[PDB]
């Protein structure tokens, strides 16, 4: 039998730990500081940043989803990143 002490000891050096129900629950619940910051952005900027560096789509695909050229998706992306960097003073709480 694999020991609970052994399961935990192994979890100490693994890319994902023995996660609890509470951790999963919180991860499935809103991250209020982040959700409010994203909702502060305008629709186009929030959508560009979400598609770009939350879902990780390539820029041509982000274009094809929002049917705008690549340059203006890149514009919306860099400027929404700036606006969110301003909006998130809780980076210092997490950085």
């Amino acid at each position: 039998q694999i020991t609970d002490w052994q399961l935990a000891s192994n979890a100490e050096h693994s890319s994902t730990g023995l996660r609890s129900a509470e951790v999963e629950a919180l991860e499935a619940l809103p991250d209020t500081e982040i959700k409010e910051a994203l909702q502060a952005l305008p629709e186009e900027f929030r959508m560009a940043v979400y598609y770009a560096d939350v879902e990780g789509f390539p820029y041509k695909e982000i274009a094809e989803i929002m049917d705008t050229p690549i340059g203006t998706v890149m514009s919306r992306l860099h400027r929404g990143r700036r606006q969110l960097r301003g909006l998130l003073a809780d980076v210092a709480r997490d950085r």
């Binding site: 982040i34 994203l38 940043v49 560096d53 997490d94």
Partner: peptide
């Protein structure tokens, strides 16, 4: 949230 934060900053 971690992906967003890492991208922005």
């Amino acid at each position: 949230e971690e992906r967003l934060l890492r991208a922005i900053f």
